Amino acid sequence: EAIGYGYQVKNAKVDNSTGKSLTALLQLIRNSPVYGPDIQFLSFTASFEEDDTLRIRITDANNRRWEIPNEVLPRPPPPPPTTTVLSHPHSDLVFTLFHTTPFGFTIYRKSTHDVLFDATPIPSNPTTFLIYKDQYLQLSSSLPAQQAHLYGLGEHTKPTFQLAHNQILTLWNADIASFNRDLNLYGSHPFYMDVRSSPMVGSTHGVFLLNSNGMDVEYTGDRITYKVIGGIIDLYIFAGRTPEMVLDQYTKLIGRPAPMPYWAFGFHQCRWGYRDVNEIETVVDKYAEARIPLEVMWTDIDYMDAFKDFTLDPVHFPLDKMQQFVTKLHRNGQRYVPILDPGINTNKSYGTFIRGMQSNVFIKRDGNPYLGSVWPGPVYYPDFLDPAARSFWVDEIKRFRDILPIDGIWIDMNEASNFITSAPTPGSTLDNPPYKINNSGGRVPINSKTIPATAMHYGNVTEYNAHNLYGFLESQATREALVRTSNERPFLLSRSTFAGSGKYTAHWTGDNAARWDDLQYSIPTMLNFGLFGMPMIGADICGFAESTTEELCRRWIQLGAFYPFSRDHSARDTTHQELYLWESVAASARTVLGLRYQLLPYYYTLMYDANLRGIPIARPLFFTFPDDVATYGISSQFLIGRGIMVSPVLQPGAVSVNAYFPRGNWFSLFNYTSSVSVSAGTYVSLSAPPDHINVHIHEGNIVAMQGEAMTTQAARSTPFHLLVVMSDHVASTGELFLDNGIEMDIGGPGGKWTLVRFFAESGINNLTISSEVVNRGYAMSQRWVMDKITILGLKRRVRIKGFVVSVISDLRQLVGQAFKLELEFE
Ligand SMILES: *[C@@H]1O[C@H](CO)[C@@H](O[C@@H]2O[C@H](CO)[C@@H](O)[C@H](O)[C@H]2NC(C)=O)[C@H](O[C@@H]2O[C@@H](C)[C@@H](O)[C@@H](O)[C@@H]2O)[C@H]1NC(C)=O
Ligand SMILES: *[C@@H]1O[C@H](CO)[C@@H](O)[C@H](O)[C@H]1NC(C)=O
């Protein structure tokens, strides 16, 4: 038989009133034995949530089906031949319903008529049809093959940021090592960005399927097809038209990226396998002696008593010694983060287990607590959809934190990971679904090495439907536990994630390997997570799995010192890879972390931007240069903020690197006399000696720097150096966000912040550098000082009343005080 026969439009109307909407009723043409029971009647709605966002919702007309709870991801509620057209006056998006047999729909741009999403079926081809079965949702759109450039649909390791043609991307949260290309990993993000090179270059939109079910997405270049194993179609189209606007629109829906504390941008050190407190103290001492900045010390499962949460190995990590250690860290302006797994060991003498059982907090199967296996052995999983489990979690964290101070939480293994696979429930189409997603690249059963689909959650909810939300839900609860036990802005690192997770947590690429391939892979992943609203992203520096090498680690710390989230972490069965162990690595580290720390106020500003507008910290070249199609395909370079570009060496033995430069003038942040000038965008073979990493700034930008220091605390009290890069084509601008570093609600009406804007422009005989201040209230309260300005991008020197570098010293200017500084040429 045919997979399905599709739907006809039974009726359709424009809802109207003050706010336009489109309601239709769809009817199944004919039933099919393949993939299970067809939903016979569908309710179809198209509606505008904002001017710039169109929502397509397709549900069973006669039965409520699974939807991501509004509590979990709050959002505006659903609305209450021949064609039916929907369009507002202030929207660029036009929706059309085609009463063909089977039916069709499209979304195009009012202005350019450029078709964004084209779900018109090819009558002879059911793979193009809308098919809607209880455990098989099929939705397909045609694409302009060469013109459509697609990004996202996480979480997968790929050598390219831009999605290659002709693949299947599987979304199903799984404990699969990120050193594996292509395979579905820890998180699921059913969002893609579609950048069009033509007809109007750089014109971008976003497409989001708000669905937590397992799915395959097939992308063949001229076509994209969702094949989903449950829930509903809840499809959102974001108008863009810039990439930054798409992410603004997307994060407006799924949640704005969480603020991060300033210290989170410090350098982080971890290792699986640190044997005792004395060892971690030694590591900290050795970082210090190496004059390598270290902000945060981390402890992996080693610290626990027999792999049990909320406990301390009484021999190797005794509480008194641990409290002394953390106290010393804090005294030195340093911080501490421990790991927590979700699995609660079933030990009878374990208080956490006892309290968990009392509050009935655990995920069940066939009416009994589901018995998983992880590091501690037999475990029970807290049901984070259960409010009682959330309280329990908060309470356990309170208890532990009362005894041992912590500064953040690392939540791991929260897919949820399971070292065993349970037997399927006989007869259950949930544990044995009619359509097999391409789990682990092998149509592996979904229940593989996780919690079975037939397991149950609060509100009679099946793991089948909720599985992809587990880590996300643990993140919510964990953040809340931190917020409820400290007034400081919290910090959370999560392995498993879902769309919206960024509102709560940072993420890292997981179990990567000490391989050159992986070094490179970190860049697309990093960029992807920006698109996913999770800008606080990074990869284990020098590689998690496998023993690293001096050269690899050296090149890794170089690159990694610019990850928003910068952590050295390693697996236990490997040679040690702390940065002080090789001299060449240490030297690189001091140089690159040096620059990172000088850039702290900038990264913090970028974090501010991210929370405000969803714009990622580490961004693609095409975010700043969308009109330059050469940048779409770049996967080995990236921007930090608007106009700084990092161009890493990603090959062994290489002492140069072939790097794309967009139009204009670019200046090395490591040596201002080094520059690159290209009249049109092109590759340049940059010199890249063993100790050197290429980092350049583009003309038209101002970045406010501060000084190097062993801690971020110390760094905040150093003088500001303003770096002004002049452009012949446009005024230079820049921005600096400052606050007390705890306001839970960043940049809020609470007002404990300032935004300083810088401006710079050349006259024919003079040069003006100036600043504007917002929230002078808070600004006038702060003792920040600018003592130096450096001016790049001019071919003549300037003074107070081939390229050259001008430097204005001894300024003694308060940052919080708006200034206008007049300079003249020589
Ligand atoms: C329940 O907790 C017990 C004490 O915390 C665990 O026993 C211990 O496990 C340690 C290794 O994880 C071992 O070095 C300790 O000496 C030992 N302590 C005692 C008092 O026996 C127990 O772990 C189980 O039994 C041990 C010996 C190993 O076989 C583990 O793999 C087992 O998990 C914990 N029970 C469970 C069910 O995990
Ligand atoms: C910096 O760059 C200049 C110009 O390319 C070069 O000649 C110089 O020796 C470099 N090193 C420095 C300033 O340490």
What stretch of H or E contains 703? strand 701-705
Helices (H), 255-350: 277-289, 319-331
Are the CB atoms for 436 and 361 separated by under 8 Å? no
CA of 348, nearest ligand number: 1
Beta-carbon contacts of 353 under 8 Å, excluding residues fewer than 6 positions away, are: 344, 345, 346, 347, 380
CA of 378, nearest ligand number: 1
Residue 788 CB neighbours (<10 A): 17
What CA–CA distances, in Å, run from 535 to 50, 79, 625, 813? 24, 32, 19, 33
Residue 221 has phi, psi (to 5 degrees) of 90, -55
CA atoms within 13 A on the CB side of 757: 8
Are the CB atoms for 12 and 85 separated by under 8 Å? no
Angle between helices 600-613 and 243-254 (to 10 degrees): 70
The letter for the amino acid at 770 is S
Residue 450 CB neighbours (<10 A): 25
What stretch of H or E contains 154? strand 148-156
Are the CB atoms for 776 and 738 separated by under 8 Å? no
State how far the Cα of 259 lies from the Cα of 263, in Å rounded to an integer.
Answer: 12
State how far the Cα of 6 lies from the Cα of 481, in Å rounded to an integer.
Answer: 48
List the chain gaps (C–N > 2.5 A) by preceding residue: 80, 801
Nearest to 704 by CA among 776, 659, 754: 754
What CA–CA distances, in Å, run from 644 to 345, 638, 684, 695, 813? 47, 8, 16, 7, 25
The verdict on whether 546 is a catalytic residue reads: no
Are the CB atoms for 650 and 519 separated by under 8 Å? yes
State how far Cα 342 lies from the chain centre: 22
CA atoms within 13 A on the CB side of 527: 32
Instruction: Provide the sign of the torsion angle of the four alpha carbons 50, 51, 54, 59, taken in this order.
Output: positive
> In the sheet that 664-668 helps form, which strands lie side by side, from edge to edge?
618-619, 638-640, 644-647, 694-698, 664-668, 675-678
In DSSP terms, 235 is beta-bridged to: 56, 209
Residue 309 CB neighbours (<10 A): 25
Query: Which of 67, 412, 431, 518 is flagged as catalytic?
Result: 412
Instruction: Provide the sign of the torsion angle of the four alpha carbons 669, 671, 672, 673, taken in this order.
Output: negative
Angle between helices 470-483 and 387-403 (to 10 degrees): 50
Looking only at the bridges linking them, the beta strands covering 377-380 and 344-345 are: antiparallel
State how far the Cα of 667 lies from the Cα of 663, in Å rounded to an integer.
Answer: 13
The verdict on whether 415 is a catalytic residue reads: yes
Residue 105 CB neighbours (<10 A): 27
The letter for the amino acid at 522 is S
Contacts 24+ apart (CB under 8 A), 282-289: 283/578, 284/329, 284/334, 286/578, 286/580, 287/578, 287/579, 287/580, 288/710, 289/580
- Using most ligand atoms within 8 A of CB, pick from 305, 347, 348 the residue to mutate for ligand 1: 347
Q: What ranges make up the beta strands (E) of 203-328?
A: 203-209, 215-219, 223-228, 233-238, 268-269, 296-299
Residues with CB under 6 A from ligand 2: 671, 673-674
The letter for the amino acid at 574 is T
Beta-carbon contacts of 308 under 8 Å, excluding residues fewer than 6 positions away, are: 345, 347, 350, 352, 376
What are the tokens at 70? 């509004």
State how far the Cα of 471 lies from the Cα of 489, in Å rounded to an integer.
Answer: 20
Q: How far apart are the first and last CA of the chain?
A: 83
State how far the Cα of 145 lies from the Cα of 164, in Å rounded to an integer.
Answer: 11
Any idea which residue has 């010390």 for tokens? 297
HEC letters along 601-645: HHHHHHHHHHHHHCCCCEECHHHHCCCCHHHCCCCCCEEECCCEE
Burial string for 216-245 (b: 16+ CB within 10 Å, else e) reads bbbbebebbbbbbbbbbbbbbbbbbbebbb
Nearest to 409 by CA among 474, 327, 500: 474
* Closest CA to ligand 1's atom 11: 306
State how far the Cα of 179 lies from the Cα of 555, in Å rounded to an integer.
Answer: 18
Residue 435 CB neighbours (<10 A): 21
Instruction: Provide the sign of the torsion angle of the four alpha carbons 7, 13, 15, 18, taken in this order.
Output: positive
In DSSP terms, 772 is beta-bridged to: 757
State how far the Cα of 724 lies from the Cα of 806, in Å rounded to an integer.
Answer: 10
What CA–CA distances, in Å, run from 345 to 362, 378, 411, 452? 12, 6, 16, 18
Q: What ranges make up the beta strands (E) of 763-819?
A: 766-774, 785-794, 798-800, 804-814
Residue 714 CB neighbours (<10 A): 16
Give the SS3 label for residue 244.
Answer: helix
What are the tokens at 314? 């009484």
How would you class 486 by CB atoms within 10 Å of its CB: exposed for 0-12, middle for 13-18, buried for 19 or more?
Answer: middle
State how far Cα 705 lies from the chain centre: 25
Q: How many angstroms does the Cα of residue 723 sit away from the middle of ligand 2?
A: 18
State how far the Cα of 136 lies from the Cα of 298, in Å rounded to an integer.
Answer: 43
The verdict on whether 134 is a catalytic residue reads: no
Q: Is the peptide bond before 144 cis (omega within 30 degrees of 0)?
A: no
CA atoms within 13 A on the CB side of 489: 17
State how far the Cα of 382 lies from the Cα of 370, in Å rounded to an integer.
Answer: 10
Are the CB atoms for 681 and 661 separated by under 8 Å? yes
What are the tokens at 8? 């006809």
CA of 671, nearest ligand number: 2
DSSP state of 382: B
Residue 719 CB neighbours (<10 A): 16
How would you class 159 by CB atoms within 10 Å of its CB: exposed for 0-12, middle for 13-18, buried for 19 or more?
Answer: middle
State how far the Cα of 433 lies from the Cα of 217, in Å rounded to an integer.
Answer: 17
How would you class 19 by CB atoms within 10 Å of its CB: exposed for 0-12, middle for 13-18, buried for 19 or more?
Answer: exposed
Instruction: Provide the sign of the torsion angle of the four alpha carbons 587, 292, 571, 183, taken in this order.
Output: negative
- Using most ligand atoms within 8 A of CB, pick from 591, 669, 672, 673 the residue to mutate for ligand 2: 673
State how far the Cα of 103 lies from the Cα of 130, in Å rounded to an integer.
Answer: 8
State how far Cα 162 lies from the chain centre: 16
Are the CB atoms for 404 and 417 separated by under 8 Å? no
What stretch of H or E contains 479? helix 470-483
What CA–CA distances, in Å, run from 349 to 353, 355, 373, 381, 649? 8, 11, 18, 18, 53
State how far the Cα of 616 lies from the Cα of 228, in Å rounded to an integer.
Answer: 29
The full length of the chain comes to 826
Residue 800 CB neighbours (<10 A): 11
**Given phi > 0 = left and psi -120 to 50 = alpha, else beta, which region is 500?**
left
Catalogue all structural domains in the chain, each as residue range(s) with its CATH number: 1-256 (2.60.40.1760), 257-598 (3.20.20.80), 599-699 (2.60.40.1180), 700-826 (2.60.40.1180)
State how far the Cα of 178 lies from the Cα of 158, in Å rounded to an integer.
Answer: 10
Residues with CB under 6 A from ligand 1: 305-306, 345-347, 376-378
State how far the Cα of 82 lies from the Cα of 177, in Å rounded to an integer.
Answer: 50
Burial string for 339-356 (b: 16+ CB within 10 Å, else e) reads bbbbbbbbbeebebbebb
Q: How many angstroms does the Cα of residue 309 sit away from the middle of ligand 1?
A: 14
Q: What ranges make up the beta strands (E) of 431-515?
A: 456-457, 461-462, 492-494, 506-508
What stretch of H or E contains 776? helix 776-779
Q: How many angstroms does the Cα of residue 352 sit away from the middle of ligand 1?
A: 16
What stretch of H or E contains 339? strand 335-340
* Closest CA to ligand 1's atom 1: 347
